[PDB]
Design a binder for this molecule. Structure first.
Ligand SMILES: COc1ccc(-c2cn(C)c(=O)c3cc(C(=O)N4CCN(S(C)(=O)=O)CC4)sc23)cc1OC
Length: 127
């Protein structure tokens, strides 16, 4: 069995910014979700080998996880907040697309997503 290469977290020729909205996405959004009791399935790329999900990457073609997002934020990979927000939304959507409706992992994603939406609702104005 095999996993794909993980998503990109470093690219020296991608232009980058450090901004107050991106700072909020690390300090408030990522940190809030990371510490949650249901974060663990989402803290690293899905390991389809260890988890015995041989069809995962047959179904999910845009993988994303909070480990990747954390690295992107810490290594200032993004230009804007919308790129990062999109990564969170991709992660949640993948979970809902792959899993059977009602499963434990879906409930976990929903709990994280509720907090995500609450924090993004108060994304600060650009300075
Ligand atoms: C380090 O531990 C974990 C990491 C990731 C997941 C995990 C993450 N995400 C995002 C998922 O979508 C996901 C689905 C999983 C799973 O075990 N499933 C759903 C798919 N089926 S199946 C039969 O359709 O392949 C098996 C059960 S584990 C997991 C679960 C872990 O341990 C419980």
């Amino acid at each position: 069995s095999m996993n794909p290469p993980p998503p990109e977290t470093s690219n020296p020729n991608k232009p980058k910014r450090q901004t107050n909205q991106l700072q909020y996405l690390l300090r408030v959004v990522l940190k809030t979700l990371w510490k949650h009791q249901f974060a663990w399935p989402f803290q690293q790329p899905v390991d389809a080998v260890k988890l015995n999900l041989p069809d995962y990457y047959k179904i999910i073609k845009t993988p994303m996880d909070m480990g990747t997002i954390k690295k992107r934020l810490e290594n200032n990979y993004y230009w804007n907040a919308q790129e990062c927000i999109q990564d969170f939304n991709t992660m949640f959507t993948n979970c809902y697309i792959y899993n059977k409706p009602g499963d434990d992992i879906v409930l976990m994603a929903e709990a994280l997503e509720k907090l995500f939406l609450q924090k993004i609702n108060e994304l600060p104005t650009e300075e």
